[PDB]
């Protein structure tokens, strides 16, 4: 293929950004995601990230599909439907912990999907058991 053209449509930073999920752990209704920066861009514009979680919620004892978007906050103890991260800047070759506050504890033995989209475009999907 032809080399990609860098112009008004495509920024090098899109090609240079890469995140992976090292681990996901659940405590109560709190998801702690260890996010790793495997690219060469600094990540700091967290308000510009998108975070989606799909899971099965325990709503009054009923296992109920839930898919929601989560909004960023600098607050270290977020409300439900909010997430935060324990660093002001996630540099290449480092990890940070992204904390997502779910509206309900997950129903046990169900699968969940976490989607994290950087402000630059590139993203990561994690699917698994909690």
Residues near a copy of itself (CB under 8 A): 9, 47-48, 50, 52, 54, 65, 67-69, 111, 113, 115, 117, 121, 123, 125, 127
Q: Which residue's CB is nearer to a copy of itself, number 97 or number 119?
A: 119
Distant-in-sequence, close-in-space partners of 76: CB < 8 Å, separation ≥ 6: 84, 86
Q: Which residue's CB is nearer to a copy of itself, number 4 or number 94?
A: 4
Strand order in the sheet with 123-129: 19-27, 30-37, 95-101, 82-85, 62-72, 50-59, 111-117, 123-129
Q: Minimal distance in Å, beta carbon 120 to a copy of itself?
A: 10
Q: Which residue's CB is nearer to a copy of itself, number 94 or number 129?
A: 129
Q: Minimal distance in Å, beta carbon 121 to a copy of itself?
A: 8
Strands 111-117 and 50-59, how do they pair? antiparallel
For residue 110, CA distances in Å to 52, 58, 66, 105 come to 17, 10, 12, 11
Q: Minimal distance in Å, beta carbon 69 to a copy of itself?
A: 6
Q: Which residue's CB is nearer to a copy of itself, number 96 or number 116?
A: 116
Q: Minimal distance in Å, beta carbon 56 to a copy of itself?
A: 12
Strands 111-117 and 82-85, how do they pair? unpaired
């Amino acid at each position: 293929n032809q080399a990609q053209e860098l112009n008004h449509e495509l920024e090098l930073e899109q090609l240079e950004t890469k995140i992976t999920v090292s681990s996901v752990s659940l405590t109560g209704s709190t998801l702690n995601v260890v996010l790793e920066n495997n690219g060469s861009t600094n990540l700091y514009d967290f308000q510009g990230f998108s975070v989606i979680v799909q899971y099965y919620a325990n709503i009054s004892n009923i296992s109920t599909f839930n898919l929601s978007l989560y909004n960023y906050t600098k607050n270290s103890n977020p409300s439900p439907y909010y997430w935060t991260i324990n660093t002001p800047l996630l540099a290449p070759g480092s990890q940070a912990t992204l904390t997502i506050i779910l509206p309900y504890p997950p129903y046990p033995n169900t699968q969940a999907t976490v989607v994290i989209v950087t402000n630059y475009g590139p993203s990561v999907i994690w699917r698994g058991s909690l």
